[PDB]
Scaffold this active site. Structure first.
Site, PDB file in Angstrom:
ATOM      1  N   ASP A 155      31.369 -13.956  33.914  1.00 52.94           N
ATOM      2  CA  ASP A 155      32.670 -13.379  34.905  1.00 52.94           C
ATOM      3  C   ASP A 155      34.030 -13.770  33.490  1.00 52.94           C
ATOM      4  O   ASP A 155      33.827 -14.499  32.919  1.00 52.94           O
ATOM      5  CB  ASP A 155      32.931 -15.391  35.516  1.00 52.94           C
ATOM      6  CG  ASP A 155      32.625 -14.432  36.955  1.00 52.94           C
ATOM      7  OD1 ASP A 155      31.881 -13.844  37.760  1.00 52.94           O
ATOM      8  OD2 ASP A 155      31.107 -15.234  37.169  1.00 52.94           O
ATOM      9  N   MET A 204      32.575  -9.771  47.626  1.00 48.81           N
ATOM     10  CA  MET A 204      32.887 -10.873  46.959  1.00 48.81           C
ATOM     11  C   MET A 204      33.126 -11.568  48.355  1.00 48.81           C
ATOM     12  O   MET A 204      33.347 -11.198  49.414  1.00 48.81           O
ATOM     13  CB  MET A 204      34.133 -11.395  46.666  1.00 48.81           C
ATOM     14  CG  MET A 204      34.004 -10.942  45.104  1.00 48.81           C
ATOM     15  SD  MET A 204      33.998 -11.380  44.039  1.00 48.81           S
ATOM     16  CE  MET A 204      34.270 -13.028  44.003  1.00 48.81           C
ATOM     17  N   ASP A 260      28.762 -12.013  45.476  1.00 54.97           N
ATOM     18  CA  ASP A 260      29.040 -13.091  44.374  1.00 54.97           C
ATOM     19  C   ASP A 260      29.965 -13.872  45.478  1.00 54.97           C
ATOM     20  O   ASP A 260      30.945 -13.353  45.950  1.00 54.97           O
ATOM     21  CB  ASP A 260      29.323 -12.285  43.492  1.00 54.97           C
ATOM     22  CG  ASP A 260      30.143 -13.643  42.133  1.00 54.97           C
ATOM     23  OD1 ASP A 260      29.524 -14.345  42.076  1.00 54.97           O
ATOM     24  OD2 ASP A 260      31.245 -12.604  41.388  1.00 54.97           O
ATOM     25  N   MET A 291      38.278 -13.625  33.289  1.00 55.73           N
ATOM     26  CA  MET A 291      39.227 -14.000  33.858  1.00 55.73           C
ATOM     27  C   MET A 291      40.354 -13.974  32.675  1.00 55.73           C
ATOM     28  O   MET A 291      40.313 -14.860  31.924  1.00 55.73           O
ATOM     29  CB  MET A 291      38.902 -15.050  34.173  1.00 55.73           C
ATOM     30  CG  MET A 291      37.977 -15.441  35.771  1.00 55.73           C
ATOM     31  SD  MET A 291      37.999 -16.786  36.643  1.00 55.73           S
ATOM     32  CE  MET A 291      36.281 -16.556  37.192  1.00 55.73           C
ATOM     33  N   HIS A 294      25.764 -12.106  35.274  1.00 49.64           N
ATOM     34  CA  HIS A 294      26.536 -12.042  35.780  1.00 49.64           C
ATOM     35  C   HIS A 294      27.528 -12.955  34.256  1.00 49.64           C
ATOM     36  O   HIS A 294      27.971 -14.342  34.665  1.00 49.64           O
ATOM     37  CB  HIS A 294      26.806 -12.338  36.582  1.00 49.64           C
ATOM     38  CG  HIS A 294      27.740 -12.191  37.597  1.00 49.64           C
ATOM     39  ND1 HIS A 294      28.075 -11.093  37.652  1.00 49.64           N
ATOM     40  CD2 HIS A 294      28.808 -13.190  38.668  1.00 49.64           C
ATOM     41  CE1 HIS A 294      29.524 -11.001  38.667  1.00 49.64           C
ATOM     42  NE2 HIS A 294      29.344 -12.124  38.836  1.00 49.64           N
ATOM     43  N   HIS A 317      31.573  -8.922  35.467  1.00 53.67           N
ATOM     44  CA  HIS A 317      33.068  -8.922  36.073  1.00 53.67           C
ATOM     45  C   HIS A 317      34.705  -9.321  36.020  1.00 53.67           C
ATOM     46  O   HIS A 317      34.157  -9.993  35.347  1.00 53.67           O
ATOM     47  CB  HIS A 317      32.399 -10.410  37.470  1.00 53.67           C
ATOM     48  CG  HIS A 317      32.999 -10.492  38.757  1.00 53.67           C
ATOM     49  ND1 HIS A 317      32.910 -11.307  39.220  1.00 53.67           N
ATOM     50  CD2 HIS A 317      34.157  -9.608  39.585  1.00 53.67           C
ATOM     51  CE1 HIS A 317      33.994 -11.179  40.503  1.00 53.67           C
ATOM     52  NE2 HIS A 317      34.565  -9.917  40.085  1.00 53.67           N
ATOM     53  N   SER A 357      25.228 -16.744  37.269  1.00 50.54           N
ATOM     54  CA  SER A 357      26.788 -16.894  36.908  1.00 50.54           C
ATOM     55  C   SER A 357      27.193 -17.720  35.564  1.00 50.54           C
ATOM     56  O   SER A 357      26.309 -19.375  36.246  1.00 50.54           O
ATOM     57  CB  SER A 357      27.771 -16.662  38.186  1.00 50.54           C
ATOM     58  OG  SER A 357      28.967 -17.545  37.559  1.00 50.54           O
ATOM     59  N   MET A 409      37.587  -9.877  36.250  1.00 53.26           N
ATOM     60  CA  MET A 409      38.277 -10.302  37.216  1.00 53.26           C
ATOM     61  C   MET A 409      40.054  -9.855  35.879  1.00 53.26           C
ATOM     62  O   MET A 409      40.520 -11.294  35.860  1.00 53.26           O
ATOM     63  CB  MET A 409      38.186 -11.344  37.580  1.00 53.26           C
ATOM     64  CG  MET A 409      37.661 -11.480  38.450  1.00 53.26           C
ATOM     65  SD  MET A 409      36.969 -13.158  39.043  1.00 53.26           S
ATOM     66  CE  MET A 409      35.515 -13.395  37.425  1.00 53.26           C
TER      67      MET A 409
END
Ligand SMILES: O=C(CO)[C@@H](O)[C@H](O)COP(=O)(O)O
Ligand SMILES: O=C(CO)[C@@H](O)[C@H](O)COP(=O)(O)O
Ligand SMILES: [Fe+2]
Ligand SMILES: [Fe+2]
Lengths: 220, 221
Positions: B34, B138, B172, B36, B32, B67, B7, B69
């Site tokens: 992320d 998670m 994760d 958000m 990976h 990912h 990440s 979010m």
């Protein structure tokens, strides 16, 4: 008193540091950093975590103008302040309480910007113009770079400059060497430019041209 | 069949291409990424425009695990596919109809991930496990890097491994050379690791360590 702040929206976002560094080394007066949360506008850029890394890369001295295209501007005030932003420019359309937010931004040591979208009446700013450091008159619908400059926004700029002589007025969207004079003759003194500057081999010359056109037009 | 995906959440985000390149060169199996939106979680990272720039800088080889979010995962499927993402991992808690979203992801040519927060019972993931490519358990509350691994999540991993033997299962949050053992023994074969890899002086050896621990557990099963 005319300043040029490049926008990095259409830069190499995998190399924001290098992109911003070239802008600063080319004499940019400030950096205009577009923050989009995918909610207030239909796109996502980056938030305070990128700003923190940028501040570390670029040093203490460069000025960050944060264009906060986010649905909850109240939420990101401290995070942006801690990351090292100098000015927090929120959208009048997004806040639940402009007065409270303006105060919070100042408590956090940042300058206060207030932005309006093209469809938003300039008179919405009147009650707040004396409390803010800068008004941002969008000249495209926010969300994306490379859109067409809306000349029909100029009467908003002119109205603000006439009503509030001391207020910094920024224009943002489709501003380049083709449209900057229109902005300057209307009263804008802070110029955001993205796509027009981002490709140049010699951004210094383009930046100087924008600044010079704007200053000479202001001298009238 | 074990894979390590660093990440980059706590990397030098101003130099994201460089950070990703050195992860790949250090032997990362995938990246990976992320995403958000400041609404589904109380933080904002980046979205499809950054992914597009990364894909351009890294070329077409590297595998991007997105990912997501975000509170409206439906909205970003096409934009992410167009940007060059390989896998779209959405949160079970972020949609009223995971079935329709799963279909739309495949129609857009991406692999399908489905994630659950620590507070969310693994039971709610089960109806969809046969339709997805990867389940994400998670092991920290999403939104922030560097948090402490929640070992209490391991029964979720173990239960999925038992019920869905062919399912790829990702963990994760707070995964490192210590806690990877718990993940592996529970049945995880995809390991996301941020702070443990990023702040290491020898990312190659950390990645090797994580993969080896996982393979050893994978072999025992
Ligand atoms: O805030 C925005 C767009 O939402 C502006 O900052 C644009 O990024 C301006 O870029 P160009 O229109 O100059 O390409
Ligand atoms: O999705 C997330 C956090 O929401 C993870 O991918 C973080 O990046 C955690 O990484 P560690 O530093 O905990 O390994
Ligand atoms: Fe902007
Ligand atoms: Fe993640």
């Amino acid at each position: 008193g005319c300043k040029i702040g490049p926008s990095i929206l259409n830069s190499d976002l995998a190399n924001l540091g290098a992109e911003c560094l070239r802008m600063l080394d080319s004499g940019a007066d400030y950096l205009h950093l577009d923050v989009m949360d995918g909610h207030f506008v239909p796109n996502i850029t980056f938030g305070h975590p990128v700003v923190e890394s940028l501040r570390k890369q670029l040093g203490q001295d460069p000025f960050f103008d944060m264009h906060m295209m986010v649905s909850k501007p109240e939420q990101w005030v401290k995070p942006m302040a801690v990351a090292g932003a100098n000015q927090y420019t929120f959208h009048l359309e997004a806040t639940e309480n402009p007065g409270a937010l303006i105060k919070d931004i100042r408590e956090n040591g940042m300058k206060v910007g207030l932005a309006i979208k093209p469809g938003t009446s300039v008179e919405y700013l009147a009650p707040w113009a004396n409390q803010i450091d800068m008004a941002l008159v969008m000249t495209v619908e926010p969300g994306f770079g490379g859109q067409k400059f809306m000349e029909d926004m100029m009467p908003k700029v002119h109205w603000l400059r006439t009503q509030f002589p001391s207020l910094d007025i920024e224009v943002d969207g489709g501003v380049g060497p083709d449209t900057v004079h229109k902005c300057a003759e209307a009263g804008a003194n802070m110029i955001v430019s993205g796509s027009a500057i981002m490709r140049s081999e010699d951004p210094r010359s383009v930046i100087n041209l924008l600044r010079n056109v704007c200053s000479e037009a202001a001298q009238k």
